[PDB]
Amino acid sequence: EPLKVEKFATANRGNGLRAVTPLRPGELLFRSDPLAYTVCKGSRGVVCDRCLLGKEKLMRCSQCRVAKYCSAKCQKKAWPDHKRECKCLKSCKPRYPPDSVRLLGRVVFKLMDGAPSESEKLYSFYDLESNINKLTEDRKEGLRQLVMTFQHFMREEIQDASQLPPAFDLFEAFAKVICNSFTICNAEMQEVGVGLYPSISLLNHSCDPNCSIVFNGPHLLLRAVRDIEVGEELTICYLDMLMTSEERRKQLRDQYCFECDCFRCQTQDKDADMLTGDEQVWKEVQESLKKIEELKAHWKWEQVLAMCQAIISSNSERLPDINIYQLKVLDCAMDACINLGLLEEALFYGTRTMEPYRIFFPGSHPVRGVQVMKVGKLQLHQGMFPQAMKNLRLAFDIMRVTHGREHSLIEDLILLLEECDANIRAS
Ligand SMILES: CCCCNC(=O)c1ccc2c(c1)NC(=O)C[C@H](C)N2C(=O)c1ccccc1F
Ligand SMILES: C[S@@+](CC[C@H](N)C(=O)[O-])C[C@H]1O[C@@H](n2cnc3c(N)ncnc32)[C@H](O)[C@@H]1O
Ligand SMILES: [Zn+2]
Ligand SMILES: [Zn+2]
Ligand SMILES: [Zn+2]
């Protein structure tokens, strides 16, 4: 069709997107490649720099020796967007720049040297929100340091403003990046990358949204996850669902410079359940998760598992599985076990997440769709067919809404459903 969405000017939250026509759950609203993107710090050399797929088979750029790739095709295609950054990268090894700086380098190369980008159809990098009049002095110091890091990293390819676009202010561009960066997760919901998607950046936040985004490599799909009326603002949740209203407050302040007075934030919706169990215990668990989550972002599965087991099967006092810190521990342990092939133990943690995930991810949410598929997949390969089929159908009922036929993972689920169904049919 023409578009199901259009940019408009909201009353109190700058620009927004709104429905042009009524929308149903699962309808594809928009799709976009990035303006610019980069692999994350902790997944560097663990995933293809370009398609963001994992492998043990990864060849690597001998020029800079920082880029890794899954294929000759991926190395070659990533050359135009990695030609200019190439020199700068080698030229500063091994104190590597923060992701935000590498990301902005690619933005600049792309605005200088690229044709207009399809990702900027509804809204461009130039139009993005900076919140400059809301930034705290502490935030500004932080952005100054990013500007100086950028001028250093980029010295070879960029010495002055004629090499940057028309009047382009680097302080403002980092301001834009802070509140318009998308985290790119792979099919298994692990963080692998960071990109800008300027048309998608019109979406304002809601702690109970009507839309969802999902990624297939660097490609982004925006889908409705509820019914939406003509004229209704389109929204997505910018944050992890496993957070309390206080945690959301801090993050929405610090990164996005706004205050949320939605129903959930006004009522502290779910907050008491999330923090059930003994406070001294969940305090330490939340402390240890810093490290467990760091190890995870670096794919260090045996170490993740060791630390999770010391919590889950601790000799000292334990937490309910509905406690968010406990829950995040169980999830990391599950993922560790999957990636280490300890499938019975993976299933044990996975099944325990099921009921909390039902509660903390209401309606249709891609994170729940994927977790349910994962558990269903584990059961399937232990011959637990009736319980598998149950979970695979549930995953399909979520992911037909959240991922849809345009996302290749749905094809994988379809194969699992046909397999499980074969088994039952014959039994
Ligand atoms: C510019 C304003 C948008 C900021 N937000 C996002 O970029 C975003 C949020 C949540 C995401 C993703 C991206 N990425 C995905 O692949 C979808 C899944 C649902 N999702 C996560 O699970 C997630 C949860 C908390 C932290 C980071 C995460 F990636
Ligand atoms: C990705 S942008 C969203 C588009 C933005 N409103 C614009 O005008 O370009 C993120 C910024 O939008 C604003 N924003 C998003 N959700 C909001 C909300 N629920 N209430 C108020 N402001 C919000 C904040 O300025 C935030 O830093
Ligand atoms: Zn690749
Ligand atoms: Zn290179
Ligand atoms: Zn809220």
Curated annotation (Swiss-Prot):
InterPro entries xref list: H3K4_H4K5_MeTrfase, Hist-Lys_N-MeTrfase_SMYD3, SET_dom, SET_dom_sf, SMYD3_SET, TPR-like_helical_dom_sf, Znf_MYND
Pfam family, one: zf-MYND
Entry annotated with the keyword Transmembrane: no
Broad class of the protein's primary localization: cytoplasm
UniProt cross-references to CDD domains, sorted A to Z: SET_SMYD3
Residues bearing the modification Phosphothreonine: 21
Tissue specificity annotation: Expressed in skeletal muscles and testis. Overexpressed in a majority of colorectal and hepatocellular carcinomas.
Family per record: Belongs to the class V-like SAM-binding methyltransferase superfamily. Histone-lysine methyltransferase family.
UniProt subunit comment: Interacts with HSPCA. Interacts with HELZ. Interacts with POLR2A; the interaction may be indirect and may be mediated by HELZ. Interacts with HSP90AA1; this interaction enhances SMYD3 histone-lysine N-methyltransferase.
Name of the molecule in the record: Histone-lysine N-methyltransferase SMYD3
Species per Swiss-Prot/TrEMBL record: Homo sapiens (Human)
Gene name as annotated: SMYD3
